Each structure stands twice: as C-alpha cells, then as structure tokens.
Design an enzyme around this catalytic site. Structure first.
Site, PDB file in Angstrom:
ATOM      1  N   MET B  39       0.828  -1.203   0.000  1.00  0.00           N
ATOM      2  CA  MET B  39       0.000   0.000   0.000  1.00  0.00           C
ATOM      3  C   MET B  39       0.862   1.252   0.000  1.00  0.00           C
ATOM      4  SD  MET B  39      -3.280  -0.972   2.293  1.00  0.00           S
ATOM      5  CE  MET B  39      -2.546  -1.021   3.914  1.00  0.00           C
ATOM      6  N   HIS B  43       8.878   0.983   3.672  1.00  0.00           N
ATOM      7  CA  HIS B  43      10.004   0.933   4.572  1.00  0.00           C
ATOM      8  C   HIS B  43      10.761  -0.384   4.418  1.00  0.00           C
ATOM      9  CE1 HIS B  43       7.566  -1.673   7.012  1.00  0.00           C
ATOM     10  NE2 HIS B  43       6.669  -0.727   7.247  1.00  0.00           N
ATOM     11  N   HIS B  46       8.844  -3.734   3.890  1.00  0.00           N
ATOM     12  CA  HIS B  46       8.414  -3.934   2.503  1.00  0.00           C
ATOM     13  C   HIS B  46       9.553  -4.274   1.567  1.00  0.00           C
ATOM     14  CE1 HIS B  46       5.674  -0.723   4.179  1.00  0.00           C
ATOM     15  NE2 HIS B  46       4.826  -1.718   3.971  1.00  0.00           N
ATOM     16  N   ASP B  79       8.568   9.424  -3.334  1.00  0.00           N
ATOM     17  CA  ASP B  79       9.504   8.733  -2.457  1.00  0.00           C
ATOM     18  C   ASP B  79       9.480   7.208  -2.622  1.00  0.00           C
ATOM     19  OD1 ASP B  79      11.391   8.341  -0.320  1.00  0.00           O
ATOM     20  OD2 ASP B  79       9.690   7.892   0.997  1.00  0.00           O
ATOM     21  N   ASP B  80       8.281   6.646  -2.718  1.00  0.00           N
ATOM     22  CA  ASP B  80       8.126   5.204  -2.912  1.00  0.00           C
ATOM     23  C   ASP B  80       8.821   4.770  -4.186  1.00  0.00           C
ATOM     24  OD1 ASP B  80       6.703   4.934  -0.566  1.00  0.00           O
ATOM     25  OD2 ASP B  80       4.741   4.823  -1.583  1.00  0.00           O
ATOM     26  N   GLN B  83      12.592   4.689  -3.883  1.00  0.00           N
ATOM     27  CA  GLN B  83      13.052   3.491  -3.181  1.00  0.00           C
ATOM     28  C   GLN B  83      13.051   2.265  -4.084  1.00  0.00           C
ATOM     29  OE1 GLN B  83      12.286   2.845   1.155  1.00  0.00           O
ATOM     30  NE2 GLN B  83      10.780   4.465   0.742  1.00  0.00           N
ATOM     31  N   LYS B 151       5.029 -10.629   9.123  1.00  0.00           N
ATOM     32  CA  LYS B 151       4.495  -9.526   9.965  1.00  0.00           C
ATOM     33  C   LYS B 151       2.962  -9.656  10.099  1.00  0.00           C
ATOM     34  CE  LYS B 151       4.369  -5.310  11.970  1.00  0.00           C
ATOM     35  NZ  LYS B 151       3.042  -5.640  12.570  1.00  0.00           N
ATOM     36  N   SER B 187       6.952  -1.008  11.251  1.00  0.00           N
ATOM     37  CA  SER B 187       5.627  -0.621  10.852  1.00  0.00           C
ATOM     38  C   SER B 187       5.630   0.899  10.732  1.00  0.00           C
ATOM     39  CB  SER B 187       4.612  -1.049  11.931  1.00  0.00           C
ATOM     40  OG  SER B 187       3.337  -0.463  11.718  1.00  0.00           O
ATOM     41  N   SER B 188       4.847   1.393   9.777  1.00  0.00           N
ATOM     42  CA  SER B 188       4.635   2.834   9.632  1.00  0.00           C
ATOM     43  C   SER B 188       4.004   3.441  10.890  1.00  0.00           C
ATOM     44  CB  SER B 188       3.768   3.119   8.392  1.00  0.00           C
ATOM     45  OG  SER B 188       2.503   2.466   8.482  1.00  0.00           O
ATOM     46  N   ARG B 189       3.309   2.614  11.661  1.00  0.00           N
ATOM     47  CA  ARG B 189       2.651   3.108  12.878  1.00  0.00           C
ATOM     48  C   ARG B 189       3.606   3.404  14.019  1.00  0.00           C
ATOM     49  NH1 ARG B 189      -2.793  -0.602  13.437  1.00  0.00           N
ATOM     50  NH2 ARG B 189      -3.455  -0.473  11.230  1.00  0.00           N
TER      51      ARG B 189
END
Ligand SMILES: CC(C)(C)[C@@H](O)C(=O)NS(=O)(=O)OC[C@H]1O[C@@H](n2cnc3c(N)ncnc32)[C@H](O)[C@@H]1O
Ligand SMILES: CC(C)(C)[C@@H](O)C(=O)NS(=O)(=O)OC[C@H]1O[C@@H](n2cnc3c(N)ncnc32)[C@H](O)[C@@H]1O
Lengths: 286, 279
Positions: B39, B43, B46, B79-80, B83, B151, B187-189
């Site tokens: 999604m 990071h 992924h 940015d994605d 990467q 994960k 995690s992005s969280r």
C-alpha cells in the site's frame, strides 16, 4: 503431465492432470476452450461444445461436475440426473478431446472455506428463494477457470441470469478469459431444452410450450411497448393448463440497477407439477 | 501493441490492462514474474519482500502500490518510486481506485471462518477486502510467485487459503519479519508512539521471543512467559495473545505453532507474532 491422445476423448479426474495437460497444450499454441456442465448432456449443451469446437486451433475441455455447493438441501442434489455413459459417448461423437470429471473430494477437500460472494443480482430472480445458489455457481466456475485456464469459456443463454453473473465474475476479478454466450437450443415447438424436461409427463410437456409461446408473442408485441409485451405473455401463460408462474419480469439486458430502455430481456419461471422450467428471450422495445 | 517496457529501469503503469500486457509479454520472453503487493509508504519491511523477489533467477519484480478502500493512510508516491528504483525493481503498478473497482464493489471474496478471528475481531470485513484485492492483483499480473510478510501472519495464512481453495496457480512466499534494533516489528505506525509508548512497545517482541525459548517447558510455560513480559509494561492494552498451530487452527499437543499478540498503546495498535516449537 499425463498422456494426451489427440483426435480422441481423454478423460481426467484429477485437477492437477487437466491443469498440466491444458498448460502443455496452450504452450504449443492450441487455444483451450472450456464448456462447464453438470452432465446429463443434451443438444443444448452440445451447442456450446460445437461453438467451442469451431474456434480455430481450439482444444475443447468439457467439465462434468454436479456441484453440491449450488444445491439447497432437500433432495435436489440426489435428484439431479446422472447419465455419465451417454455423456462421454456424446463427447466422443462430437470430437471433444478432453473431459474433466473431478470428484467432490478433489474440488472441496476443505469443505466450504473461501468462497465467492456474488453481487446483489444473485439475490433476485432465481436467487430469491435460493439465496446461496449463485455463490455455489460462481465459486465452482472460478475454480474451473483456475484449473483449466481456458482462453474462452462458454455459457448458454438458457441460464441467462447465470451468464450475466459469470460476466460480472470475470469483470470484477479481472479474469483473463473471454465469456462466450451461446443462444438457447429449443425443441421443434419452442420448448427450451433442459435436462429437467424429462420430468414432464405427456400432458405437462404439451402445456410447457406456453413458456416459449408467451415469450415469443411478447417479443413481437413489443413494437407496442412494454405493457403490451408483458400482457401478451401473461395472456398466453394464463391460457395454459397447469402452468403456475413463479415470476415473469422484463429487465434491462444486464439485469442490474438500470431501467429498461430500448433493449431488454424477458425472463419467466413456471412450475408444471413439481418441475420448474425457465425460459428467457431478447426484447426490443418499439 | 504491447506497452513500452524499458529493461533495468523502473517502468510505472497505472492501467491494469497495461501491466497485464507487459507481464504477459515478459513471461513469454523467459522472465519469472514476481508480485509484491503493498500500500506504499515503503520501509525496510516492505523492501525485504522486494529483495526476496529479486533474487529469484530470471525475475522481473512487480510492486503494486494501492490503498484498498475495501479493507488518511500515509501517501508518498515520489519517495516510494525512488526506493523501488534504488532496489532495481523494473515494474511499479499504481492503479486508481476507479481503475481497480470500475463497477464499484460487486463480486467479492468471502473468506473462511479464520477471517472472523484475531484481527477479524475489531475488523470483521478487513480480510474480505484483502483477499478480494489480492485475487484481482493475481489475475491482473499473473505472477509465478507472490510475496507476503510474516508480519501479517494471519493475512499470509488467509492468502494460502485463497490460493488452495480457488486452485490458483501461484506460489505464495512468506518473508520473515523485519525488526528495529530492539526487536520492534517494523511498521509505519511506530512513529506515532511517544517516547514512553515506544519504550513500552518493546514488550511485544520481548514477550514473544521469551515465549519461544520458554517453549522447551511446554505450551503453558510459553504463554505464561509472554504474559509476564507484557504485564511488565505500562500502557499496553493487550487485545489478544494466542498460541495456534501454523495454519492458525487450534494448537496441537506438541509440534510447530505460532504465538500472535496485538495490543493498543494509546490510539496506536501494534501486532507481532513468532514461530513456537512445543517441547
Ligand atoms: C456450474 C455450471 C455452470 C456448470 C452449472 O450451473 C450449469 O449451468 N450446468 S448445466 O449442465 O445445467 O448447464 C451447462 C451449460 O449448458 C447451457 N445450456 C443448458 N441448456 C441449454 C440450451 N437448451 N441451450 C443453450 N445452452 C444450454 C447452460 O446455460 C450452461 O451454460
Ligand atoms: C493488500 C495488501 C497485502 C497489499 C495489504 O493488506 C498490506 O498488507 N499492505 S502493506 O503495505 O501493509 O504491507 C505490504 C506487505 O509488506 C509486508 N510487511 C510489512 N511490514 C513488514 C515487516 N516489518 N517485515 C516483513 N514484512 C512486512 C506485509 O506483511 C505485506 O505482505
């Protein structure tokens, strides 16, 4: 890969077997055609087979599988006609090269686990009283498509709601298969061919012509508008001894959340004793 | 005509038909198509999937970036893509919602009962959304292998159910969880956690690793060890802590299993899980 002999009927029961053969065939350039059936084959099924067969370079796979998931409890599953000897004989006579005849255990080794949930159309018409029927159909057709990976898959206009739902399945899941609708095969008097016609006694067989008579009358009455078309069909069904109408509906051709414009489909379901018959026809308004 | 594909460059496609055509063309040329569903907001977790896909000989890597409304989330497309370029990925698939759902939500996948459990407690329609979009991506891209992180273990198991149940011709590959230096699953969280929360968050991984080693003394020892570690942390609201077999059925008397935990720290929900061997 197991043995495939061309010009001959090859019968495979194991999904892995037909998958391997299909893949091998497709890699040598043959286009694979799929004709899903529940057996008890008659000329209506054979129309789909012949349509498959005329695709150039085609190899035809006819699946025969009486899918328990799409039956409601109450004896319908046990009552479904099974004539496997005649079926395979007819496939040989038609020059079909592959019959896929899987077991229930091979198709449902884990029972009903992941399944297909159809859109709102599955709750209407045939699905009204049988709210799980089309989830059964869509689930098994998705599996068949994944196993066989055909270039094209063939469905009869006889089961028009089913055909519409399969196009939705194909669109909604981005399936890389072309869905080919095949026109309804009828007896000489108009009665749509069905494996269920065998349950009509001579009197009921006589009265059953009313479904196709009503629809065809409607199709011609439709120059005068929708009310005229529907009332013509109703008049014919009302004149018919021992026909009990379950529904008679004129819809847009996609059967979906759109009003009838110029192009429609008139669909009927009726009981003659315990036998429930369906028929449908293209309608052009005006 | 097949859409343009430039080897050794990042090729971006937004139309499902385009990525489908390029994928088909490429597989016919003797490439093995690898799919990595994401999604975005990428990071290192992924990227571990990307690197797993890349090392398959003959691979062309397809990374999808699509936020599935069916299952605001961080959005960093420039940015994605950078990467992915830096990873040597050759295909990014970046569809719109309207392109993925042109007829809205109509035919969908209904998962089996596992979808109602664990993460399906708070979000009982989440996995329907996941399996629906993954099935679509599989049909669009038609990869040889598809990559998912451990994960989201429950997600991974459900995808294996999807593949088996629908007779899908793709190999599902699970990729080990990437962790921060102290064990916290990436995690992005994680960035939402304040200092006290971030320090307390280490209890999830510490609890699971303690359990995995306590497991020589049996299942109950493993569970009690994990609960003790979580009980040592302030502000960690445990939603569940469950030992199951590797397919997330009930845990056998001995053999291989998985311990899964989920917890809320303030408004941030964190998950972790680990392999357990009983005895
Ligand atoms: C899961 C299945 C899709 C296999 C199942 O629901 C099913 O419909 N099985 S079936 O054996 O009853 O029919 C097989 C195919 O033959 C088609 N068919 C039947 N009778 C006629 C006819 N008289 N003229 C033209 N076509 C016809 C029917 O519409 C369907 O596409
Ligand atoms: C429909 C989707 C499958 C695209 C969606 O539900 C989803 O999971 N999206 S995602 O962007 O949240 O995750 C993409 C993939 O990265 C994996 N992943 C994330 N973090 C890690 C990590 N720290 N270590 C290892 N693997 C990780 C995650 O499990 C999933 O397989």
């Amino acid at each position: 890969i197991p043995a495939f002999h061309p010009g001959e009927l090859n019968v495979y029961s194991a999904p892995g077997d037909v998958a391997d053969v299909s893949r091998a065939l497709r890699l040598t350039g043959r286009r694979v055609m799929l004709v899903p059936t529940m057996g008890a084959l008659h000329e209506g099924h054979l129309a789909l087979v012949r349509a498959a067969k005329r695709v150039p370079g085609s190899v035809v796979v006819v699946s025969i599988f009486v899918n328990p998931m799409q039956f409601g409890a109450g004896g319908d599953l046990d009552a479904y006609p099974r004539t496997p000897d005649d079926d395979l004989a007819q496939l040989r006579a038609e020059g079909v090269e592959i019959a896929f005849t899987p077991t229930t255990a091979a198709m449902y080794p884990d029972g009903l686990r992941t399944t297909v949930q159809p859109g709102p159309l599955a709750a209407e018409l045939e699905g009204g009283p049988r709210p799980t029927h089309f989830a059964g159909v869509l689930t098994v057709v998705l599996k068949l498509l994944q196993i066989v990976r055909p270039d094209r898959v063939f469905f009869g206009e006889k089961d028009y709601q089913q055909l519409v739902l399969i196009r939705q399945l194909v669109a909604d899941f981005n399936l890389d298969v072309a869905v080919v609708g095949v026109p309804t095969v009828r007896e000489a008097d108009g009665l749509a061919m069905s494996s269920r016609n065998r349950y009509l006694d001579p009197a009921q067989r006589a009265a059953a012509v009313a479904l196709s008579a009503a629809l065809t009358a409607a199709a011609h009455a439709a120059t005068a508008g929708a009310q005229a078309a529907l009332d013509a069909a109703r008049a014919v069904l009302d004149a018919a001894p021992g026909v009990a109408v379950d529904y008679l509906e004129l819809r847009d051709i996609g059967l979906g959340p759109m009003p009838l414009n110029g192009s429609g489909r008139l669909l009927v379901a009726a009981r003659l004793g315990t036998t429930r018959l369906l028929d449908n026809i293209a309608i052009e308004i005006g």
